[PDB]
Amino acid sequence: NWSELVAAADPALVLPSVAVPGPLRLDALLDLGEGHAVGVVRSADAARWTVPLVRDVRRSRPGDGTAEHLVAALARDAAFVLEAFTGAAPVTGERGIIVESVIVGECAVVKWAVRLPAEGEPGSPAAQRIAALARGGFTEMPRPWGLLTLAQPVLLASVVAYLPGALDGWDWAVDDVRRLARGELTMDQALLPAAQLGTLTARMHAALAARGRTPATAADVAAWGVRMREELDEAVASVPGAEGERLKAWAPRIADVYAELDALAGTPLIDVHGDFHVGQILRADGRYAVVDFDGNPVLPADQRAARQPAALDVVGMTASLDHVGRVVVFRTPDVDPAPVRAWIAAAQRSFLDAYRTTLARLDADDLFDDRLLTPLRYAQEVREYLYAVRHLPHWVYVPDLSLTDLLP
Amino acid sequence: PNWSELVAAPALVLPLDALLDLGEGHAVGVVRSADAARWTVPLVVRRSRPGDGTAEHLVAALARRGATPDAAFVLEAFTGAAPVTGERNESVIVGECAVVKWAVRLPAEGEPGSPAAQRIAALARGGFTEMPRPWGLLTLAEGAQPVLLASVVAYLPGALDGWDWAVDDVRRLARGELTMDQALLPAAQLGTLTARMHAALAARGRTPATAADVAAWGVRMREELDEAVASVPGAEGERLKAWAPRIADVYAELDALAGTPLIDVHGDFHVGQILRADGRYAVVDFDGNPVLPADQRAARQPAALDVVGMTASLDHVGRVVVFRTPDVDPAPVRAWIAAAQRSFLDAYRTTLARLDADDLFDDRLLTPLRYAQEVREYLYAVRHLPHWVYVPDLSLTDLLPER
Amino acid sequence: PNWSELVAAADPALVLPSGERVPGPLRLDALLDLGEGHAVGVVRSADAARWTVPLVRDGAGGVRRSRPGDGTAEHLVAALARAAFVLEAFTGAAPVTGERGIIVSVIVGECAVVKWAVRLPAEGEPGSPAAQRIAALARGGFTEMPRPWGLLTLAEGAQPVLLASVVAYLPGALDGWDWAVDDVRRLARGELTMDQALLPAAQLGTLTARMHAALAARGRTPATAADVAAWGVRMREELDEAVASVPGAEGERLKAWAPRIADVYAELDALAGTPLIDVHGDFHVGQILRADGRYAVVDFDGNPVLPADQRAARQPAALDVVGMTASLDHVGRVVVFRTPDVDPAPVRAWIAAAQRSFLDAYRTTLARLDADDLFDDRLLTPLRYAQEVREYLYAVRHLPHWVYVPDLSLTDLLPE
Amino acid sequence: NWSELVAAADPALVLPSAVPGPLRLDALLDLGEGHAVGVVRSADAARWTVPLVRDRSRPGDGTAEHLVAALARTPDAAFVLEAFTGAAPVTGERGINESVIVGECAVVKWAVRLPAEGEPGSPAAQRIAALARGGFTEMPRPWGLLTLAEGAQPVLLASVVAYLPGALDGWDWAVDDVRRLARGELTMDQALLPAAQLGTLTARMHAALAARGRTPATAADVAAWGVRMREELDEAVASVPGAEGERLKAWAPRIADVYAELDALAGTPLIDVHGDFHVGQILRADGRYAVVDFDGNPVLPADQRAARQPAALDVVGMTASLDHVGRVVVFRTPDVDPAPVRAWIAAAQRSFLDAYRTTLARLDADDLFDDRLLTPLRYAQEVREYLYAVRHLPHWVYVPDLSLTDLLPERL
Ligand SMILES: [Cl-]
Ligand SMILES: [Cl-]
Ligand SMILES: [Cl-]
Ligand SMILES: [Cl-]
Ligand SMILES: [Mg+2]
Ligand SMILES: [Mg+2]
Ligand SMILES: [Mg+2]
C-alpha cells in the first residue's frame, strides 16, 4: 500500500541527494501506472514535498521512468490537475540534468517542485505564469508541454520543451558586447538584441495582464519602502572596503528616492516574471525564449506569487544589461571600455524604446509606470550588494560602477 | 619560369633565397623582403591556402623514407609520419591526424629564432612521449644553427589546456565530486612529466651560468619589482611596497649562484601548456619565453625556471576557483594549493633521481624565481587585466611567511 | 529606288532611334516587306555592326526610320496575325491597329507591346536569347509572363537572330522595385502583417521554379573544369575592380573585406559537373510585374555585364536564385534608406524571412516538378558575394550613392 | 436637440478615424435633411469641427455634399458661409484634417483640430479670401469658406476649393523638367520658363496678400529671429554626424555672423505670407500653376502659424526649393550629367528672382521684398534641412551640404 509504504519509509525518501523529521505521511498520490506515482509527502515538521515514487518503494531516479510516465499521462485524480498543451508527445528515455530536472525523450524537460509550501500558503506561481502566456499567444518561450498542480493550485511538476543548443543571457549577451568591443559587430548590430528583448517583455506583460490588474494600495507602496530601506541598511552594514564607503555616502540620497514611493498609490500591479534578467533569456538561432517563472528568490516563498509592477521586470532587465557591460570590461583582457560603456546606455535606451512602443501597439500603455524606474533601479543595485557579500564577494564592483553612473 | 623570377613578380608572404620543391607545383620557399625580412611562404604562383595541397605534400615528403637530402633544407621525419590526405603564424590541419604550422615570420640571417625544432627533436630522441606525437620538422641549414620553417605534430581535438581541466578538477574538489587524493594525482603526474622533459632536453648538454648571467638575473628582477611597486594601486600596492625590501633581499641570493646548470628548457611552462588528451597529458608550445626578445628565446635557462612556472600556475588555479565560484568553500581549495605544489615537487625530485638527473634542478633558485613569477603577475594585471592583482597578492601572502 | 540603294545612300544615323546625341556607309542585309511602304531592315554598318531598323518610305522616293505612329509596328502585328524570316505567332495575336510610343518600344492597339532588337550580333555570332526563352516557356505551360503574341527572327546558323518581339500590354502594371517597395513600406507602418508581406516572396519562389523547370526542358550542360575556372577569374577581376574604384568609408570596409570575399570564390573549383541550363540572366524584382494579384516576368535579353556574344550561354539555375534573393535584400535597404520616419526593425526582419520564403517555395516547387538537381545550393554563397560586388560596380559607374546597398548587405553576410 | 445628443455622446465622436468627456456643443450649423456641422468642445477646452448627421459623418454620408449644396445659395449669425463664383451642387463623396472629394471636382477639408477659444488658428481662410479679393487666379478655384464668428479672428471650420485630378506638385514636374534638361529633351530656356512663371506667381500672390496690411518689424522681432536661428544652428551642429557635420561645425561661425546682421533690419515690412512655400505647394495643371496649403509653417506653434512674416521668407523657401530640386536629380538619376543641372540650379533662382522683382514693379509693390533678408533667411532654410535629415531622413544631409558649399563662398 502506498500510504503504508511511505509512512514506514526513511524520512530521506523526499530528498534527491540532509535531515528530514520523520515519520512521513502521504497526503496525496497520483498513480502514473506500471508502479510509478507522484507523491505529496508530508514530513514530521509539517513540511510538504513532491516525491516521484516507484515500487520495488524508493524515490524515482533519472532512468526509472517516472518523468517518462508523467509525460505520457499528459498525452493521455480529483486532488490533482493535469493540464496538457499543444505539442506534448509520449517520448521515452530519461536523462538527468543538474540545472530536480529530467530530460525526457531528449526533447522535453520535467522539473519536480521538490519543496512545497505549507498547506494553505502560496507557493511558486510558475503554473499560472506559463498557462497565462500560453493562453495569450506568447510564443517567445520554451514550448510548454504540461503542468501538474495540486488543488491557487500548488505546482508539483512542469514539462517544457528542451533546447539543447541554447545559451542564457550571461553567455550570448556577454559574447555580443565582446564582439562589439573588438570590432566584430557594429553598434546597431549589438543593440538589436536589446530591442528584441523590449518587444519580448511587453508581449509577456500584455499576456500576463490578461488575468487581472490590482491597483496598489497605500499599505502596498508603504511596505515597499520599508523593505527597500531595510535592504539598504543591511547592505551598508555588510558591504566592506572602498565600495562600502561609497555605499554609505550614497545611502542618504537613495533613501530620499525611496520616500517618493508613498505618492505612487494606485499604480497597476499585474502578474510579472519576478526574477527578470538576461540570464533568464535563452537565444536559439535568432529566437529568444524566457524561462524561470518561480519568482524572486530573495522574497519570502509566500510572496513570490504576489502581483508586482510591470516596471519591476523592466528595471531587472535594464540593470542586467548594465551589469553585462560591467562584466565584459571586468573579465576581458585588453578590452576597449569605450564601446562597452557606450553600449550600456544605448542598450537600456533601445530596450525602453521597444518596450514602450510594443505596449502602445498592444494597447497596454498604462501597465508601465515609469515613475518607478529610479526607485526600483536603486533597489536592484542594492540587491547586487547583498548577493555579493553572501555568495560572490568580488561582485560588489558591479553595483558600485552602476550606481556611479546613476548618481552623477 | 623558374621559382626565382616567378616569386619576384608582396602579399604572397602574408595569409627568394631557398626553395624546397614538393612536386606537382607545390613548394616551400624562403622569401626575403626589401627590409631584409625573411618569410616562409608555401607556394603553389599564389600563396598556398588550406585545400591547395601544399601542407599535404609536405606530410607526404615526411612519410617518404629514403629521399635524397637537399643541401639547403633538412627534413627530419618521425614514426608518426603517414601520408594522410585532406586540409583544414599559419597552421593547417592535414587529414585530421597532423597539424602543419608554417613559421611565417623568420629571424634575420644569422639571428636565432624559435628553438621549437631543437626542443621537439631532443624530446623525441630521449623517449619523451608526453606530447603531441611528432611527425616531422623542416629546417633551413644555417651554420650549426637551424632555422625552423615548419612543424608537423599529431592532432588532438578533444584536448583541453590546464586552465580548463585543472580549474575543473579543483572546482569539483570544492563541491565534493573529487577526493583530495584524486585532485592531487594530476599535480603529481605533471611533476613526473616535467622531470622526463628536462632529462631529455639535458641530453644535448648543459652550460654553467656565469657570474654575469646570475648578475643579469637580479638586475632584470629588480627592475620588474620597481615597475610593479610603481604601478599597482590601492591596498594591494601598499602591501607589495612593504614586501619589496624582503623580496629584493631574496634576489641578492643570486650573486652566489654562479655555476648553476643551464639547459634547454620549455621557456613558457605553466598549466595552460599541458593538454588532457586520451587520458594522458601532452605539453605544447616550445617557442620560448614571450617576455624575452626574439633572439633570446633559444637561450638556455635553469630547469627550476620551468618548475616555478608550473608551481605558480598551480597556485593561481586555486585562486581562480575561490574568486570566480559563488558559494565556494575556500578551505579545500587552499588545502589543495599547498598539497598540489608538494605533489609536483616531490614527484619532480624523485623522477629526476630515477633518471640520474637530480643535478639539473637547483632548488636554491626556487624561492627567488618564484617571487619573480608572482611579481610578473602584477605587471600583467596593471597592463592587461587590472583586477588580477588579487592572484599575486594572495599568493605572496602564503609564500613570504613560509619562505 | 529599291530598299538596298536607299539604305546605302542614307545617313548612318538611320539605324539609331533617338540615341542620336555609327560609321558609314550602310549596307542592307535583309528586308522583310510589310506592305504599303513599311519594312523591317537588317542594316550592317561599316564596323560590321548590324541593326534592326524599322523602315518607311516618305513618298518622295526616300527612306527614313519608323517613328511611333508611322504604322510599321502596326504592320508587323498584322503580319503575325496572317524561309529567310520566321514569323512565329502565339495564341492571342490579333491584327490591332494604332501606335503609341513608350520609353523603357511601340504600343500597338493599346493591348500589345512591340520591341525592336535595335542592336544585333555580328554576322554568325549569337545575340539575345529572348526568342528562345519565351518560346520555351510558352510551349512549357509557363503562364506567369505577359502573353506572347509573336516573334520575328532571322534564320542564321544555329540560333535565329531575334529581330522583334510582341507581347501583351499590361497598363498600370508595376515592376518589383515599385510593388515590393510598397509592400515593405506598408509592413513598416503596420498596414500589412508579416505573413501578408511574405506571400509575394513565396510566390516568386514558385514562379522561378516553374520558370527553370520549363527552360531546362531544352536540355542541360555539365559545367566543365574550365567553365568553373573562368567564373573565379571573372569574379576576382570584378572584386579587384570594385576595390580600386569604390571610394569613401564603404571602400575602406570593402578593402578589409576583399581577402574574405576572395576566400569564398575559391570554393568554385569543386563545382565541375554542376548543371547549366537556359536561365533568365538578369533576374531581380524589377523584372517581375504585378497585375491584379498575378505576377509576370519580362526582359529575357540576358545579363548586361556579360559580352553580347555570351548572354545566350547557359548558366547555373542558382544564378537567377541569387539574383532574386539579393534584390529582396536590396528592397529592404531601399525602404529604410528612402522612407522618412521608417521603422527599420520590421523591414530588416522581412529581409531574412523573405529570402527563406523564396528559397523554401523554390525548393519545394522544383521537387514537385521533379527538378531538384537543377539547383546546386553550393553556388548560393559564392554567387551572392559576386552579386554584391556587382552592386559596387553599378554604383561607381551609374549611381555613386548606391554603394550603401552592398555595404549594408555585406555587413550582415560576413558576421554570419 | 442637437446639444442634447452631443453632450451624452462618446467623447471619441470628434475623431475622424483619447478625448476627455463630457462633450459640449458650442455652435451648430444646420445644413438641412438631418445634416449639420458642429463645433464640439471637449472637457479639456479643446474645440473640434465635427460633421454631424442624425440616424459623426463619414465620407459618403452626404454632409460634405450638403455643405457644397449650401454654398450654391449664412443661415446662422454665429457662422460665416462666404461662397464664391464656382460652387456647384455636385454629388458623390470620396474620402482621400479630413479631405473629401465631392463630385470629383471639389475638395472639402474639415478643420478637425480647432484652436482654443481666443487663440489663433490656421489663417487659410484669410489667405484664400484675400487672394480672391485681389483677383489672384493661380490657385485652385475657391468654392466657399466656413468660419466661426469669434471677434476679429474668425475660426476656420471648412474650406472648399476646386479639385485638380491630374495636377502634379512641384516635386514631380520640376524634377521631371530638370531630368529632361539633362537628357537633352529640353533646352535650358525651356527648363527655366517655369522658374520665371513661379516668380511671377509668388509676386502676384504677395501683392494680393499685402493688400490686407503691412506691419513694420520691431526691434524685438528681428532679435527673436537671430535667437531662434542661432538655436537651430547650434542644434544641427550638435547632431549632424560624419564629414557633413565637420563642415557645418566649421561653417557655423561664419553663418552665425550673418545672423547678427538682422538687427539692422528693424522696421522691415511684415505681411500675410504663405508660411510653407516650396515647389511641392505648386500644382501644374494643363499649363497653369496653382499654389496650395495655406495653413502656415508646421514647425511653428499652432497659435503662431497665422502671424505675419517677411515676404522674403517665401522667397528663400522657393529659391532653396529650386536648389534642392537640382540636388535630387543629380543624386537619384543614373548616368545623369550634373553639369546642366548645376547650371540650371543657379539659373532657375535668377529666373525666379528676376520675374519676382519685375512683377512687384509691375504691381507697384516692390516695397514688401527686402533683399537684405535673402542671405540670412536662406542659411536658416538650409540649416533646417540638416534638422529634417537627422530627425526624419538621415541621408538627406547631402542636400544642405551641397547647397551651402555653393552659397557660402558666393554670398561672402
Ligand atoms: Cl565577475
Ligand atoms: Cl579572475
Ligand atoms: Cl537609393
Ligand atoms: Cl534623396
Ligand atoms: Mg535562470
Ligand atoms: Mg527590366
Ligand atoms: Mg503640400
Residue numbers in the entry:
A (entry chain C): 4 to 20, 27 to 65, 70 to 89, 95 to 117, 122 to 173, 177 to 433
B (entry chain B): 3 to 11, 14 to 19, 35 to 63, 70 to 113, 121 to 435
C (entry chain D): 3 to 23, 29 to 89, 96 to 117, 123 to 434
D (entry chain A): 4 to 20, 28 to 65, 72 to 89, 93 to 115, 121 to 436
Sentences from the paper on this structure:
SjGlcNK was crystallized in two different monoclinic (P21) crystal forms, A and B, which differ considerably in the dimensions of the respective unit cells. In consequence, there are two SjGlcNK molecules in the asymmetric unit (AU) of crystal form A, while four monomers are found in the larger AU of crystal form B. The individual structures of the N-terminal cap, the intermediate subdomain, and the C-lobe are highly conserved in the six protomers, across the two crystal forms. In contrast to the structural conservation of the individual subdomains, the relative positions of the N- and C-lobes are strikingly different in the six molecules. In result, the distance between equivalent atoms in the N- and C-lobe varies from 31.7 Å in the open to 20.6 Å in the closed conformation, and superposition of the C-lobe (residues 194 to 420) of the six different conformational states results in RMSD values ranging from 0.6 to 5.6 Å for the whole molecule. Principal-component (PC) analysis revealed that the six conformers of SjGlcNK are related by an opening-closure movement (PC1), i.e., a hinge-bending motion of the N- and C-lobes of ∼30° amplitude. In this movement, the linker connecting the two lobes (residues 187 to 191) acts as a hinge and the catalytic lysine, K133, which sits far from the active site in the open state I, approaches and establishes contacts with the catalytic D317 in the closed state VI, likely corresponding to the active conformation of the enzyme. In summary, ATP induces the closure of SjGlcNK, and the crystallographic structures reported represent six different conformational snapshots of the enzyme, arising from the molecular flexibility required to carry out its catalytic cycle. Curiously, the conformation of the side chain of D317 changes between the nucleotide-free (where it is coordinating the single and more tightly bound Mg1) and the quaternary complex structure (where it coordinates the two magnesium ions).
